[PDB]
Amino acid sequence: TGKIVQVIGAVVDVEFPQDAVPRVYDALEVQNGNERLVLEVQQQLGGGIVRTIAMGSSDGLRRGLDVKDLEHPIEVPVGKATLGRIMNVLGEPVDMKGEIGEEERWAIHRAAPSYEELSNSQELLETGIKVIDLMAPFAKGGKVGLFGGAGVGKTVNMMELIRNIAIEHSGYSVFAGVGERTREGNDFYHEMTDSNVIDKVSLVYGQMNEPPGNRLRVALTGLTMAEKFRDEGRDVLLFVDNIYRYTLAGTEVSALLGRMPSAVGYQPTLAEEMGVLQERITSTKTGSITSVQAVYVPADDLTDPSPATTFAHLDATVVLSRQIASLGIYPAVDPLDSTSRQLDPLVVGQEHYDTARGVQSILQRYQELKDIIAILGMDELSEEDKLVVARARKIQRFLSQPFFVAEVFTGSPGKYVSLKDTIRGFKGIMEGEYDHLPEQAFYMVGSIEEAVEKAKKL
Amino acid sequence: MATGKIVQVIGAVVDVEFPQDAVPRVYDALEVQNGNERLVLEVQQQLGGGIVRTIAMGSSDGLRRGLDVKDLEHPIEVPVGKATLGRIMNVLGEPVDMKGEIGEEERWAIHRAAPSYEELSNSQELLETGIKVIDLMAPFAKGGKVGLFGGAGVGKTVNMMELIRNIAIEHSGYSVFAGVGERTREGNDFYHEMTDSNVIDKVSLVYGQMNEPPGNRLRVALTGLTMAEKFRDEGRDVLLFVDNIYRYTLAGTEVSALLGRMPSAVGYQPTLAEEMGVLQERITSTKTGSITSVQAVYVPADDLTDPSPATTFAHLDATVVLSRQIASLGIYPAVDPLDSTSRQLDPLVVGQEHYDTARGVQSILQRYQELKDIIAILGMDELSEEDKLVVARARKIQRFLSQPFFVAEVFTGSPGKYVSLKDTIRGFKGIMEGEYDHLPEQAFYMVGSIEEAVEKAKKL
Amino acid sequence: AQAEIEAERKRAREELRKQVAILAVAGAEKIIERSVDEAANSDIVDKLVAEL
Amino acid sequence: AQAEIEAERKRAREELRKQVAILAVAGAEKIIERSVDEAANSDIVDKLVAEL
Amino acid sequence: MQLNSTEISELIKQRIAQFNVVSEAHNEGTIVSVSDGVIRIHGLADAMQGEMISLPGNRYAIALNLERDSVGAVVMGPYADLAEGMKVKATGRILEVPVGRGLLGRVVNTLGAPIDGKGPLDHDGFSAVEAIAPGVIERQSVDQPVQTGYKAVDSMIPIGRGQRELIIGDRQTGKTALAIDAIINQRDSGIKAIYVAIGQKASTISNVVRKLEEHGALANTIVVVATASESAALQYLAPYAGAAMGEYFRDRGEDALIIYDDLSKQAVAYRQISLLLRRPPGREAFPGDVFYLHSRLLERAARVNAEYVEAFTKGEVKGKTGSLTALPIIETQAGDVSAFVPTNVISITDGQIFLETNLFNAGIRPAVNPGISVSRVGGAAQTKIMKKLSGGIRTALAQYRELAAFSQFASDLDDATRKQLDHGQKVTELLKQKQYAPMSVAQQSLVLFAAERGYLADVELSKIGSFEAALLAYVDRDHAPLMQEINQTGGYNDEIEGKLKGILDSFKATQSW
Amino acid sequence: QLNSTEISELIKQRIAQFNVVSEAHNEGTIVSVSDGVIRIHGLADAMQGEMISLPGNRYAIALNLERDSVGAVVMGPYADLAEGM
Amino acid sequence: EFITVARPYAKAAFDFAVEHQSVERWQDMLAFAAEVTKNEQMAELLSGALAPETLAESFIAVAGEQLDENGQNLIRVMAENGRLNALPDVLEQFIHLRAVSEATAEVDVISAAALSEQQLAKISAAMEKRLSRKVKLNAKIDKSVMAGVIIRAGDMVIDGSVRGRLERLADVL
Ligand SMILES: Nc1ncnc2c1ncn2[C@@H]1O[C@H](COP(=O)(O)OP(=O)(O)OP(=O)(O)O)[C@@H](O)[C@H]1O
């Protein structure tokens, strides 16, 4: 019924008879050589022209091809039939296994839950990781964001969180690969199959080789599976491999969609496109979603619009610094920028709250002294200022930790640290019990006892 | 009869199509019924055939494509002369004080050319303000133009209220106050202040508050000038106060994009220097009469680089720069001596006594600003004992330039002070020499005369 | 109480199931201007029991 | 606790109002379909043209 | 329980008796395009700018570009079901919202539909969302307090009834915390409250409402919501809808306090609308009129003189002056005040409170920077006791920070300087205060009196926190008649100074920190 | 799509007689006035930097020679000039 | 869409046709010009970037039913600005402006069943007093309105359909 009338990059315009024009977000279908290409409707122009984004490669499309109108949106399999499997943005199977035994398919475009449906929760969720649950602890059913530049550690951190949380948690999980590395999709899948945990995990992959329409809508395919498990009444873990790629694939198509550029050349719709995605990732009175998102920060600029908009969306935010990582302190968490809604005396209780604010106060004061030290050297400091520095440097080392997933880099074996041991260690350092140990004693040790054993051999 | 029709409404800008033989002139007024309310439009451009692009002097809300527009064959004309005094008017010269009709005998177009080169005068008679830093560092003259520059929250308004109190009550002549883009709260408080002090019968106020549509703020300053020019042409001496010159330029920026102009510079209209010059060049003192004016100038983010403040600096005669860097220390008036200046500060007016005293104070504060950089990192012991002494006497002079205003008692809680020029000069000489080397720094802060700084030292 | 309104709704269905009878005033007594003969004298109860 | 209960009771009544109105007009439509008349149709036309 | 199941039918059936057989007439258009929440319409020769246009279903659009041969309009809701050739009817209407006393304790969207699930609204009719403010002759000067309950703000940066006070700072610095504590503290002051949430995530608005309900504050408060999922038209209008509710109290002679959380999210929604309508981008890609957006919003917050109230109420209310107080919130990206939206809002308001990250990380919370914060109303907003004590505090504390910089490596301090370098640290320590713990006027005044009249000077600095807690506890058991006197009067006299001196002399002898 | 000096009476002339080149190249009419710039229809013999004489003994400099019109800048007061001069 | 750029050409042509008292002919000429614009071979030629005069004289070639003195000129003016695709819209505005000039209106009537001549009389006679123009009715009765009638003139609409009342009532929910 339709005819193609323009092809501009990822965007295809189709003309229809004016009595038959497709609705917004309808799927269309067209034969492109020896394969079938789906198009998603974005805008209705005048005169029965409709403007659409290709869910696949647009090369080899002619003008004048006949286009078929499917009467419905993009709909994907959902439920237990998706568990243990790798899926396309279109919900096609991408593992070599057979067809998916679907019973139901859901449209990927949905409304967020109503304000009446939302539920509060204050159950602190423990992690293995000294800095994270000290400085920026988080709850069951909350959202966490890992912010960082290129190569700072967003993925290794999320792989410890998967290891620690998603194996002591008992319910189902969803991992959405959004515009990331295909090698790391294959690596993750094999360690799930080797551990026989794969049968609890659904994987949607739209990695960075894929054309923009795949990278944009794969996020929504991932949520639509997680929303089925939540509405079934389960407690679900959602991992999103890089949320920034969703916004960037919007930027790539936005000019071809004919929208004037905004700000640093972003699409004008940036905050709405992000907001409508983000609001669906919520725990509800029927069931819960716990979410971890990696957030790439372009050119390390935390004031760029895309990071800046993401910060209001999330409950705990962990910021990774290139300047720390180049010290070789890992995880490269910045404790003066990382923060959580849960760092509150009522939920954590006072001993945790006081320890976190003490660490924050000492490390802030060390930043205030570093411009003195940089020119004059340390000898010019006061004898109390020297004690702040001598403590702050120990604290920065004790924030470091060996991860079990990092053994292939560091070699030394991974450590899991209790919240009781972390607050006890930092509270002991700030009380000065350990001011006789060297700085190297604290670097890469699991617990404060391990520091004193390292100190015996320096 | 009404002879044109509205053919677009986009924001504040309305396009009207007239017959091809009766097209309105540029700056003509036009009239339309916006439901019950009569609305005025001002013609900016003639374009295409018969179509004219116009700015609404009021809200566009409720306008339709198709409404009949009347062509008034004159620009906006405002009441002028004595009938204006004690009244508040809007940009169109309509009473907004509820007191009834203005009762004018004459009305003048707000658009008129500046005085010709042959008509200007150079009568730089020195004028005393009673403010230490202004009368020393940036002396006024009758008939000159004064600018109070600064970013948000630095004291332009309370400085202008102090200047209005001291000269404008003493002046014995009429005054115009233009509230360009002002806060409606402060315009009320000024009207009651002038009424309760019973000087309102000398002064006429034109108010164009922020909430008003961009057209009003664009033109309200010209209404104030046109009243001041009527009193000047009578041969009177008048004071003109402008609430904020920047807001006229900003209203130009708002409409300029809709008027189809391409952008310039920091997103300003291309015509910025022309629009500034055409307003400022009317505010001058001719051979028939003098206009003395004080203008506040908003400085965006305190960046004196920005094209709007940077352009106005050329049109003034005295320029006072209020700095947040000083204001952060609470030391009001917050006038920066190293940036404030006046055309009148030279020995042929001020005399050598005053000239030497001001150049002395500048040299000391300049030297201290370099010394202050050494101290902060190295400490003060690394100075010569002569540089230590200059750091002392400079840091005193910095505080002695402060003065409490009896328009600021509500903020301070303390009694305001007036100083003569004679006493001001003697005080700064005394800090530059030894007479007060022994007083603390805090003994100067918000004091008044030098003759009472000794008393605060005894109290301190 | 939730368990009371959950019971009371089951009781309320019968008043809703009754009062959907009275639809002639809605349709006919607006739109036909003068009042009407009951041409729907079976279809009225047909609507009632089929729809609720 | 008593504020929470009364509010849910008020919601249940407005819900029940949403239920009947939809199925009532959808029934009243069928009263037209089974009680419309050509003289009544002509009565509608002749009324409105007399007050247009 | 629900015998009304009978009676809702009688309510439903009488609606038919109200409904009306008239054929009306309307002007008509057809949708010619649909994209991103913007529609273009052909026809509508009689459409007006800012009119409500009604769409298939119960959905509406606002007419914004009246070009030749087409209208451009923005959809206030989910747009994706619209299609080309849909028939569109121009009403006569501008946008109006429900308004009244019955809004208190309800959560409503920007259109005013109740979203809390507490059933339908009780209201006192409808009022226009867009409206002109009271002119110069209709106002009265701001000279009454609205109490924050924060030691730093109520002493240093007093807010008066009818002021506009900008709360400004970076992310996660306590911007919202300050404003909801200002709401919480109005619970018994008689000042009604409005909280407008623009572009926040809906679970944050759950959490805030859950804190307002954990105190007595929610029954004093209206909550107006446009969450991050809702269309840009709904967010852009949400501040104006909140102001229209506050103006109902202001025109009656009652006081209202309105918080606009993230005015910068209102500007971002307005930029989305303007670029989708192809209006030329000005600086930083915002439209040029964005100043007129915020300035016409904020000049509605005003105190009106009694004459204006009598005229509005037609003599029902006489002798009472009504006030609306606005507390807008702006987020800066890196302390950079030079951005276009911050520079506009700083120009408009009657002052600002700067909250900043360096103080917050140092543990100075609330993180109020005394130097760059200012109130342009100042002492006229305070009670006389606070006015007397607090005037000295803020400018002294600013100079302490200059002095502390200049001193930082010098071994010898003269005792005026050495005294100054101590007093300022002890005042800096005194102004820290825990969240959700507001202090009454008499409690603030007593603690400030201890600092101004020197009674802190010998107490070691970490004990200053315990000193304050013990002093409030001591005075509440033993001297409550004076606390009642000061809280009710706000008065100050030689006997008040004498009684406070006697209390500090007695506390500091008899008690232990 | 937007109009480019496509105005009704100029079009009606070309309808009546297309070869309007029969009128002298020396002269023209103002068709727009804004901000000190005027657009002139005609002046087929105008040249870059030429002085164009306006009513009131005024001048403009011809700065854009475009395919349909001349853009000129007024060397004086402009606000009384009108289209059809 | 060509609706804005068709306006100037449409007005010029009508005023000229009035001063030459030849309005009927022109409307025929514009109709012919609008059909050659639709021919599939010419639609490629019109889209390619020929020089205006090489395009116009090739356009004039395919019409010999045009008043050359006045009608070739029109084509040459539009070609010099690339406008020839606006001809089908220039036609519709010429027809529209003509009907305003003749003070005459088309009116569309929709109903569940065909009307009587007496009803069509009362409808037309009312609308002429509503509009102060002559009216010419057309009736386009419909499958879906089950009773009543709709009247459309210009874009003003009067509704008495029962369909409209059923929804307009359900709106009171
Ligand atoms: N805890 C850690 N221990 C040892 N090495 C680490 C740790 N965290 C990160 N690194 C090193 O940082 C490098 C990159 O980290 P990672 O791959 O997680 O970054 P990333 O999130 O993929 O960044 P991007 O997505 O921008 O490429 C790896 O070499 C890893 O060894």
Ligand SMILES: Nc1ncnc2c1ncn2[C@@H]1O[C@H](COP(=O)(O)OP(=O)(O)OP(=O)(O)O)[C@@H](O)[C@H]1O
């Ligand atoms: N007076 C205070 N004392 C201690 N902690 C506080 C205080 N005020 C706020 N906080 C804490 O600061 C954190 C952020 O506060 P808030 O959410 O108000 O900041 P915000 O600037 O609104 O953040 P956002 O920019 O995300 O809106 C919260 O954890 C809150 O508990």
Ligand SMILES: Nc1ncnc2c1ncn2[C@@H]1O[C@H](COP(=O)(O)OP(=O)(O)O)[C@@H](O)[C@H]1O
């Ligand atoms: N001379 C002064 N004395 C005391 N306080 C002042 C003085 N100048 C400014 N301030 C303080 O700064 C505030 C703002 O200054 P103001 O002039 O009102 O704003 P602006 O400079 O933007 O017009 C005043 O309300 C007051 O708090």
Ligand SMILES: [Mg+2]
């Ligand atoms: Mg990665």
Ligand SMILES: [Mg+2]
């Ligand atoms: Mg000011």
Ligand SMILES: [Mg+2]
């Ligand atoms: Mg907040």
